[PDB]
Structure formats: C-alpha cells, structure tokens
Design a protein around this ligand. Structure first.
Ligand SMILES: Nc1ncnc2c1ncn2[C@@H]1O[C@H](COP(=O)(O)OP(=O)(O)OP(=O)(O)O)[C@@H](O)[C@H]1O
Ligand SMILES: [Mg+2]
Length: 216
C-alpha cells in the first residue's frame, strides 16, 4: 500500500495543544519512510493516526490494508519463543527461520536446550532488553501485512547490532514492503526513501537524506 498525509493536524485532547501540525508526506508502495525527532515530537502519535487511534482535525490520510505494528516498548507473553514470534499467525518454517535469522535470534535460540520451544514469560528464563526487543521486532515482521509500523524497535541493542539488523531485516528481508521506521540513526535516514523529522508536532524537515545534505 502507499501512505499519504496531507496537511494533517491532530489533537489528543480537544481544545489542547496539537500533537501533530500540518504534516505532509507520501510513501510509494514498498518504500521506507524514516521518522525522526526528539522525545515528545509526535512520532508514536503519527503511527497512532495511521492505526486509527488518533483522528485528524485537519487534513487527509490515505492507506489501505493490514498493518503490523511494533511498539517501542518490547513485550512477551507466556509461551515459547516460537509462539511469541508467530503470535497466532499461520506457521511456515521457511518464513519463520528467515525472520529469526534476520533478527539475529538464531544465535540466541541455538544456545537453549529447548531451542525454539524455550518458554518465556513464565518465570523461567528472563530475557535481556535486547533479546526482548528483537523478539518483538521478529513478531511484527513475521505477520503478513501491507504496512509495517516499526516504532524505535532497536531498544537495548549496541549500535553495530542495530545497524546490522536494520540492514538484514528492514532493508533486505522487508525490501518489497511498505515500511515506516521511527529511528534517529544517520545510516537509517541515509537508506530511507524519504525522511520526516518532527519537532514539537511540526515538520522540521521532509525529503531525502541527499536533500538534507545539500542544505549544509
Ligand atoms: N494515547 C495518548 N493519549 C494522550 N496523549 C498522548 C498519547 N500518546 C502520546 N500523547 C502525548 O502526545 C505528545 C507526543 O507524544 P508521542 O508519544 O507521540 O512522542 P514521541 O515522538 O513518540 O516520543 P518518544 O521518542 O519519547 O517515544 C506527548 O505530549 C504525549 O504526552
Ligand atoms: Mg514514541
């Protein structure tokens, strides 16, 4: 699917300050939009609008079909690591294994005696912050959808691991998928088809990394 926002303004609380102000962008089918900005700038709120949780007061929004959402807060439910990634979707060995590999979870899983059947969220193993984040990412990426909304999914990862998973998962495995990635890392912005930088709800910059470079 493509995604369009045109002159979008929105409020979480009627009669308050707007959380998003005159936002404009367009993603073609299969492109990657990177959304940057400081804390509170409105990045997650932008994703909430696409998911229908926040309604616009002005402007137009276009997008169509199933959404897969990866929250910036990683989470696990009681069940195996395989169950947490599949999370109710039909199982396919090749699809599952390719997601695991792209999220670098094969190394972790290979070290468990129960492999993919290690049980999480029941007081047995307590996973690291980075393991929980990669599992949450793998869960969102395994789901088949027309639009993937990945809200700062690389929590607790070191910068090289983050870079490698951005490349293996977001850029290679998901190459033909329409993606919105909330991220502030320079290499991610460099590889994105478009970049949207938010500041206090407003569009600080919108365009390509090359266009931002030319302003220097
Ligand atoms: N469900 C919500 N209901 C009411 N207000 C919200 C809600 N979600 C976010 N807000 C408020 O919207 C404003 C923008 O917050 P938002 O979560 O979109 O920023 P963010 O860019 O995602 O920040 P961060 O980088 O820390 O995740 C904040 O003032 C926040 O308190
Ligand atoms: Mg957020």
């Amino acid at each position: 699917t493509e995604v369009v926002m045109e002159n979008v303004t929105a409020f979480w609380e009627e009669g308050g300050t707007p959380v998003l102000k005159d936002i404009n962008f367009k993603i073609e089918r299969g492109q990657l939009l990177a959304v940057a900005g400081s804390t509170g700038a409105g990045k997650t709120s932008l994703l909430m609008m696409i998911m229908g949780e926040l309604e616009p007061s002005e402007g137009k929004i276009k997008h169509s079909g199933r959404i897969s959402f990866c929250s910036q807060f990683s989470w696990i439910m009681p069940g195996t690591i395989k169950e947490n990634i599949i999370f109710g979707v039909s199982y396919d060995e090749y699809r599952y294994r390719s997601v695991i590999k792209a999220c670098q979870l094969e190394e972790d899983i290979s070290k468990f005696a129960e492999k993919d059947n290690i049980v999480l969220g029941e007081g047995g193993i307590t996973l690291s912050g980075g393991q929980r984040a990669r599992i949450s990412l793998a869960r969102a990426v395994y789901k088949d959808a027309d639009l993937y909304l990945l809200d700062s999914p690389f929590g607790y990862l070191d910068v090289l691991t983050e870079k490698e998973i951005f490349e293996s998962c977001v850029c290679k495995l998901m190459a033909n998928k329409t993606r919105i990635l909330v991220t502030s890392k320079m290499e991610h912005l460099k590889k994105a088809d478009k970049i949207l930088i938010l500041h206090e709800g407003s569009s600080y910059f919108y365009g390509t990394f090359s266009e931002l470079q030319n302003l220097q």
